[PDB]
Design a protein around this motif. Structure first.
Motif, PDB file in Angstrom:
ATOM      1  N   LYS A   1      40.597  -3.882  26.719  1.00  0.00           N
ATOM      2  CA  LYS A   1      39.413  -3.284  26.188  1.00  0.00           C
ATOM      3  C   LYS A   1      38.628  -2.464  27.211  1.00  0.00           C
ATOM      4  O   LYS A   1      37.690  -1.752  26.890  1.00  0.00           O
ATOM      5  CB  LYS A   1      38.523  -4.367  25.619  1.00  0.00           C
ATOM      6  CG  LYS A   1      39.120  -4.947  24.363  1.00  0.00           C
ATOM      7  CD  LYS A   1      38.724  -4.121  23.138  1.00  0.00           C
ATOM      8  CE  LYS A   1      39.393  -4.729  21.928  1.00  0.00           C
ATOM      9  NZ  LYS A   1      39.277  -3.872  20.757  1.00  0.00           N
ATOM     10  N   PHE A   2      38.972  -2.511  28.485  1.00  0.00           N
ATOM     11  CA  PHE A   2      38.201  -1.784  29.501  1.00  0.00           C
ATOM     12  C   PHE A   2      38.910  -0.530  29.978  1.00  0.00           C
ATOM     13  O   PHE A   2      39.698  -0.564  30.906  1.00  0.00           O
ATOM     14  CB  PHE A   2      37.962  -2.674  30.741  1.00  0.00           C
ATOM     15  CG  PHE A   2      37.053  -3.844  30.450  1.00  0.00           C
ATOM     16  CD1 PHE A   2      37.571  -5.025  29.898  1.00  0.00           C
ATOM     17  CD2 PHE A   2      35.697  -3.724  30.672  1.00  0.00           C
ATOM     18  CE1 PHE A   2      36.734  -6.087  29.565  1.00  0.00           C
ATOM     19  CE2 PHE A   2      34.879  -4.792  30.328  1.00  0.00           C
ATOM     20  CZ  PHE A   2      35.380  -5.965  29.774  1.00  0.00           C
ATOM     21  N   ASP A   3      38.577   0.647  29.442  1.00  0.00           N
ATOM     22  CA  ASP A   3      39.243   1.842  29.955  1.00  0.00           C
ATOM     23  C   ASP A   3      39.099   1.999  31.455  1.00  0.00           C
ATOM     24  O   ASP A   3      40.025   2.393  32.152  1.00  0.00           O
ATOM     25  CB  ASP A   3      38.675   3.077  29.302  1.00  0.00           C
ATOM     26  CG  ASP A   3      39.087   3.089  27.845  1.00  0.00           C
ATOM     27  OD1 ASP A   3      40.188   2.551  27.539  1.00  0.00           O
ATOM     28  OD2 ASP A   3      38.135   3.183  27.034  1.00  0.00           O
TER      29      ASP A   3
ATOM     30  N   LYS B   1      30.958   0.394  19.490  1.00  0.00           N
ATOM     31  CA  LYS B   1      31.532   1.197  20.558  1.00  0.00           C
ATOM     32  C   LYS B   1      32.700   0.499  21.277  1.00  0.00           C
ATOM     33  O   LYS B   1      33.858   0.886  21.129  1.00  0.00           O
ATOM     34  CB  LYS B   1      30.489   1.514  21.611  1.00  0.00           C
ATOM     35  CG  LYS B   1      31.025   2.409  22.733  1.00  0.00           C
ATOM     36  CD  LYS B   1      29.789   2.672  23.564  1.00  0.00           C
ATOM     37  CE  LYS B   1      29.977   3.576  24.791  1.00  0.00           C
ATOM     38  NZ  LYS B   1      28.622   3.848  25.375  1.00  0.00           N
ATOM     39  N   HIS B   2      32.472  -0.732  21.744  1.00  0.00           N
ATOM     40  CA  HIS B   2      33.495  -1.439  22.509  1.00  0.00           C
ATOM     41  C   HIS B   2      34.467  -2.148  21.597  1.00  0.00           C
ATOM     42  O   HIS B   2      35.582  -2.347  22.029  1.00  0.00           O
ATOM     43  CB  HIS B   2      32.862  -2.463  23.437  1.00  0.00           C
ATOM     44  CG  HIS B   2      31.711  -1.864  24.278  1.00  0.00           C
ATOM     45  ND1 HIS B   2      31.801  -0.639  24.935  1.00  0.00           N
ATOM     46  CD2 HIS B   2      30.456  -2.421  24.450  1.00  0.00           C
ATOM     47  CE1 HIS B   2      30.592  -0.462  25.529  1.00  0.00           C
ATOM     48  NE2 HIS B   2      29.809  -1.481  25.270  1.00  0.00           N
ATOM     49  N   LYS B   3      34.009  -2.685  20.439  1.00  0.00           N
ATOM     50  CA  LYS B   3      34.848  -3.382  19.450  1.00  0.00           C
ATOM     51  C   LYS B   3      35.400  -4.683  19.995  1.00  0.00           C
ATOM     52  O   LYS B   3      36.591  -4.869  20.168  1.00  0.00           O
ATOM     53  CB  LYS B   3      35.981  -2.494  18.959  1.00  0.00           C
ATOM     54  CG  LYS B   3      35.524  -1.518  17.875  1.00  0.00           C
ATOM     55  CD  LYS B   3      34.666  -0.417  18.502  1.00  0.00           C
ATOM     56  CE  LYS B   3      34.706   0.880  17.681  1.00  0.00           C
ATOM     57  NZ  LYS B   3      34.657   2.080  18.552  1.00  0.00           N
TER      58      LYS B   3
ATOM     59  N   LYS C   1      36.525 -13.583  18.905  1.00  0.00           N
ATOM     60  CA  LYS C   1      37.534 -14.319  19.613  1.00  0.00           C
ATOM     61  C   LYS C   1      37.445 -14.076  21.118  1.00  0.00           C
ATOM     62  O   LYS C   1      37.757 -14.959  21.900  1.00  0.00           O
ATOM     63  CB  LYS C   1      38.882 -13.845  19.103  1.00  0.00           C
ATOM     64  CG  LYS C   1      40.033 -14.461  19.859  1.00  0.00           C
ATOM     65  CD  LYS C   1      40.092 -15.952  19.537  1.00  0.00           C
ATOM     66  CE  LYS C   1      41.484 -16.315  19.016  1.00  0.00           C
ATOM     67  NZ  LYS C   1      41.769 -17.701  19.403  1.00  0.00           N
ATOM     68  N   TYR C   2      37.189 -12.831  21.525  1.00  0.00           N
ATOM     69  CA  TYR C   2      37.094 -12.533  22.967  1.00  0.00           C
ATOM     70  C   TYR C   2      35.821 -13.126  23.567  1.00  0.00           C
ATOM     71  O   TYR C   2      35.743 -13.435  24.786  1.00  0.00           O
ATOM     72  CB  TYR C   2      37.149 -11.012  23.190  1.00  0.00           C
ATOM     73  CG  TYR C   2      38.549 -10.402  23.089  1.00  0.00           C
ATOM     74  CD1 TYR C   2      39.586 -11.110  22.533  1.00  0.00           C
ATOM     75  CD2 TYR C   2      38.733  -9.108  23.459  1.00  0.00           C
ATOM     76  CE1 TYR C   2      40.829 -10.515  22.307  1.00  0.00           C
ATOM     77  CE2 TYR C   2      39.935  -8.473  23.244  1.00  0.00           C
ATOM     78  CZ  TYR C   2      40.963  -9.177  22.663  1.00  0.00           C
ATOM     79  OH  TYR C   2      42.171  -8.545  22.479  1.00  0.00           O
ATOM     80  N   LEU C   3      34.737 -13.193  22.783  1.00  0.00           N
ATOM     81  CA  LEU C   3      33.523 -13.806  23.273  1.00  0.00           C
ATOM     82  C   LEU C   3      33.800 -15.298  23.443  1.00  0.00           C
ATOM     83  O   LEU C   3      33.189 -15.937  24.313  1.00  0.00           O
ATOM     84  CB  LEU C   3      32.367 -13.597  22.318  1.00  0.00           C
ATOM     85  CG  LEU C   3      32.112 -12.132  22.033  1.00  0.00           C
ATOM     86  CD1 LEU C   3      30.939 -12.000  21.079  1.00  0.00           C
ATOM     87  CD2 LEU C   3      31.761 -11.425  23.325  1.00  0.00           C
TER      88      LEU C   3
HETATM   89  C1  HEM Z   1      28.650 -13.273  27.556  1.00  0.00           C
HETATM   90  C2  HEM Z   1      29.126 -12.073  26.897  1.00  0.00           C
HETATM   91  C3  HEM Z   1      28.896 -10.651  27.055  1.00  0.00           C
HETATM   92  C4  HEM Z   1      27.736 -10.118  27.355  1.00  0.00           C
HETATM   93  C5  HEM Z   1      26.346 -10.848  27.559  1.00  0.00           C
HETATM   94  C6  HEM Z   1      28.087  -8.667  27.537  1.00  0.00           C
HETATM   95  C7  HEM Z   1      27.127  -7.625  28.101  1.00  0.00           C
HETATM   96  C8  HEM Z   1      27.440  -6.267  28.293  1.00  0.00           C
HETATM   97  C9  HEM Z   1      26.435  -5.346  28.640  1.00  0.00           C
HETATM   98  C10 HEM Z   1      24.955  -5.656  28.856  1.00  0.00           C
HETATM   99  C11 HEM Z   1      27.144  -4.116  28.830  1.00  0.00           C
HETATM  100  C12 HEM Z   1      26.470  -2.717  29.195  1.00  0.00           C
HETATM  101  C13 HEM Z   1      25.628  -2.303  27.992  1.00  0.00           C
HETATM  102  C14 HEM Z   1      26.375  -2.076  26.675  1.00  0.00           C
HETATM  103  O1  HEM Z   1      27.457  -1.487  26.672  1.00  0.00           O
HETATM  104  O2  HEM Z   1      25.999  -2.721  25.704  1.00  0.00           O
HETATM  105  C15 HEM Z   1      28.521  -4.412  28.482  1.00  0.00           C
HETATM  106  C16 HEM Z   1      29.493  -3.427  28.352  1.00  0.00           C
HETATM  107  C17 HEM Z   1      30.801  -3.744  27.989  1.00  0.00           C
HETATM  108  N1  HEM Z   1      31.308  -4.962  27.577  1.00  0.00           N
HETATM  109 FE1  HEM Z   1      30.292  -6.633  27.188  1.00  0.00          FE
HETATM  110  N2  HEM Z   1      29.363  -8.421  27.329  1.00  0.00           N
HETATM  111  C18 HEM Z   1      29.871  -9.647  27.091  1.00  0.00           C
HETATM  112  C19 HEM Z   1      31.261  -9.879  26.750  1.00  0.00           C
HETATM  113  C20 HEM Z   1      32.219  -8.863  26.670  1.00  0.00           C
HETATM  114  C21 HEM Z   1      33.566  -9.193  26.497  1.00  0.00           C
HETATM  115  C22 HEM Z   1      34.141 -10.637  26.300  1.00  0.00           C
HETATM  116  C23 HEM Z   1      34.303  -8.031  26.562  1.00  0.00           C
HETATM  117  C24 HEM Z   1      35.752  -7.701  26.503  1.00  0.00           C
HETATM  118  C25 HEM Z   1      37.028  -8.354  26.418  1.00  0.00           C
HETATM  119  C26 HEM Z   1      33.324  -6.969  26.826  1.00  0.00           C
HETATM  120  C27 HEM Z   1      33.683  -5.589  26.956  1.00  0.00           C
HETATM  121  C28 HEM Z   1      32.684  -4.664  27.424  1.00  0.00           C
HETATM  122  C29 HEM Z   1      33.035  -3.305  27.626  1.00  0.00           C
HETATM  123  C30 HEM Z   1      34.393  -2.590  27.379  1.00  0.00           C
HETATM  124  C31 HEM Z   1      31.844  -2.737  28.032  1.00  0.00           C
HETATM  125  C32 HEM Z   1      31.630  -1.390  28.603  1.00  0.00           C
HETATM  126  C33 HEM Z   1      32.001  -1.328  30.091  1.00  0.00           C
HETATM  127  C34 HEM Z   1      31.919   0.089  30.690  1.00  0.00           C
HETATM  128  O3  HEM Z   1      32.962   0.757  30.754  1.00  0.00           O
HETATM  129  O4  HEM Z   1      31.004   0.288  31.486  1.00  0.00           O
HETATM  130  N3  HEM Z   1      32.015  -7.519  26.862  1.00  0.00           N
HETATM  131  N4  HEM Z   1      28.701  -5.666  28.118  1.00  0.00           N
END
Ligand code: HEM
Length: 154
Positions: free
Chosen positions: A43-45, A97-99, A103-105
């Motif tokens: 999921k992370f480009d 946006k991220h989708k 399950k991943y959470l």
């Molecule tokens: C405790 C759980 C999580 C929290 C609190 C969280 C928080 C965030 C926040 C604050 C951002 C930057 C703002 C935004 O995009 O909304 C972010 C971006 C992102 N998150 Fe989550 N996230 C969590 C779990 C996940 C998980 C489990 C995945 C993937 C398997 C994920 C994938 C991403 C991706 C792809 C981005 C964008 C990263 C970029 O390229 O900069 N997140 N997340």
């Protein structure tokens, strides 16, 4: 669900220990997640291409992302259940946006619990782990409800 104040106390007591080193904990957690459930790396480009834990440890971008994630999680946990406003923007970007499937959470919630257990055994006994698990399940449940209102339930 509703945690009691003693449960919230157990969760914020170990979270204060994590906050002494947020970037290190963010690194350990994402590395544990990616190694355990490699599909999540897709999921992370920005990170996809990382091939080994050594590359992961050396990635500054991944370290920064860990800090961004843990800071947002910490702000939600300090709300003690009143986290509606915090969850809104988060639920919108992860659902449209991220989708990110619920399950991943669940998978990162297991990675969080594993790392707290390893690093903070004295402040993360059974009751403290139960309270953290309850706090993360509340978080997941509220985000899954938002996903639904947004049209993603996933
Ligand atoms: C405790 C759980 C999580 C929290 C609190 C969280 C928080 C965030 C926040 C604050 C951002 C930057 C703002 C935004 O995009 O909304 C972010 C971006 C992102 N998150 Fe989550 N996230 C969590 C779990 C996940 C998980 C489990 C995945 C993937 C398997 C994920 C994938 C991403 C991706 C792809 C981005 C964008 C990263 C970029 O390229 O900069 N997140 N997340």
């Amino acid at each position: 669900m509703v945690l009691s104040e003693g449960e919230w106390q157990l969760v914020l007591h170990v979270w204060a220990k994590v906050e002494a080193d947020v970037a290190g904990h963010g690194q350990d957690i994402f590395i544990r997640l990616f190694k355990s459930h490699p599909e999540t790396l897709e999921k992370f480009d920005r990170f996809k291409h990382l091939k080994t834990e050594a590359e992961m440890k050396a990635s500054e971008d991944l370290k920064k992302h860990g800090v961004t994630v843990l800071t947002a999680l910490g702000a939600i946990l300090k709300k003690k259940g009143h986290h509606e406003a915090e969850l809104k923007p988060l639920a919108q970007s992860h659902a449209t946006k991220h989708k990110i499937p619920i399950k991943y959470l669940e998978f990162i919630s297991e990675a969080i619990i594993h790392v707290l257990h390893s690093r903070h055994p004295g402040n993360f006994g059974a009751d403290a782990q139960g309270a953290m698990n309850k706090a993360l399940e509340l978080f997941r449940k509220d985000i899954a409800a938002k996903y639904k209102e947004l049209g993603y339930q996933g």
